[PDB]
Homo-oligomer: A and B are copies of this chain.
Amino acid sequence: MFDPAEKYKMDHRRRGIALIFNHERFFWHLTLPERRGTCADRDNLTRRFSDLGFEVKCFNDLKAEELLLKIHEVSTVSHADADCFVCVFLSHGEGNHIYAYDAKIEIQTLTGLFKGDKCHSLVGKPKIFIIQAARGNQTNITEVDAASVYTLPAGADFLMCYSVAEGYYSHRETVNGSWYIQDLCEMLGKYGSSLEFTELLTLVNRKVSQRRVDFCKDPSAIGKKQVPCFASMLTKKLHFFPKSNENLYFQ
């Protein structure tokens, strides 16, 4: 009875929650530069995930304590009537660490809260982490950062999506926002509601990798290409088809 075109069950009452931790400025003593244009990324994401049925919850420049509280809160609430869970980090990072305002947090400890045992209402549901994070360098300019965050996998039914891979560079425009996020959001607009999600992330790889870096205004920025990637532990096709809401309570 085995089906090679098996899809994730996406006919629950509500889509689910999409967390966005949005980090613009950092504690003085971390010496990490401003991320001017992250707020465009946050707004763009907030719109595209809204249009796909997500309850979007944005958080700006949380300290480590505040951030762990808010995520663990979400991890221990019930997602029984939800299709999936999405968690976005827009910040700096190093290795297996994302930066809150004041200190680094081990990514595995954030993903671990949503692993089958610890969050039962999400077992066998897709759990999607999108990570725009690289290393701080130390009107619309393009600022460029060296890939620093490891392209980590997680557990069954996770999809880890990374702006940039080892040996490549993450770009952010100070008004329009991150290359990766612009292209993710553009692909969500056009094909979010129809395409399989990894089919879509593959378009984002193309879009981003095709952005030319030969005739940059800054000479140093030349030849600093950006290739994103995703690490999939998904077990089925993932679609975000419009939800049948006609005469239904979805709040």
Residue in chain B with minimal CB distance to A195: B4
Q: Is the CB of B198 within 8 A of A198?
A: yes
Q: Does A209 contact B (CB under 8 A)?
A: yes
Q: Is the CB of B165 within 8 A of A154?
A: yes
Given contacts A155-B227, A195-B4, A227-B156, contact A202 B167 (CB under 8 A): no
Q: Does A233 contact B (CB under 8 A)?
A: yes
Given contacts A151-B231, A205-B233, A233-B227, contact A4 B198 (CB under 8 A): no
Q: Is the CB of B165 within 8 A of A237?
A: no
Given contacts A153-B229, A165-B153, contact A198 B209 (CB under 8 A): no
> In whole angstroms, what is the CA distance A196 to B196 when docked?
12
Residue in chain B with minimal CB distance to A151: B153
Number of interface residues of A (CB under 8 A): 41
Q: Is the CB of A206 within 8 A of B235?
A: yes
Chain B residues whose CB sits within 8 angstroms of the CB of A6 once the complex forms: 206
Q: Which residues of A (73-99) have their CB < 8 Å from a CB of B?
A: none
Chain B residues whose CB sits within 8 angstroms of the CB of A229 once the complex forms: 153, 231-233
Given contacts A4-B195, A155-B167, contact A205 B232 (CB under 8 A): yes
Q: Is the CB of B237 within 8 A of A199?
A: yes
Q: Does A190 contact B (CB under 8 A)?
A: yes
> In whole angstroms, what is the CA distance A32 to B235 when docked?
32
Q: Is the CB of B151 within 8 A of A198?
A: no
Q: Does A21 contact B (CB under 8 A)?
A: no
Given contacts A152-B166, A154-B165, 10 further A-B contacts (CB under 8 A): A153-B229, A153-B231, A155-B167, A155-B227, A156-B209, A196-B199, A205-B233, A206-B235, A210-B235, A231-B231
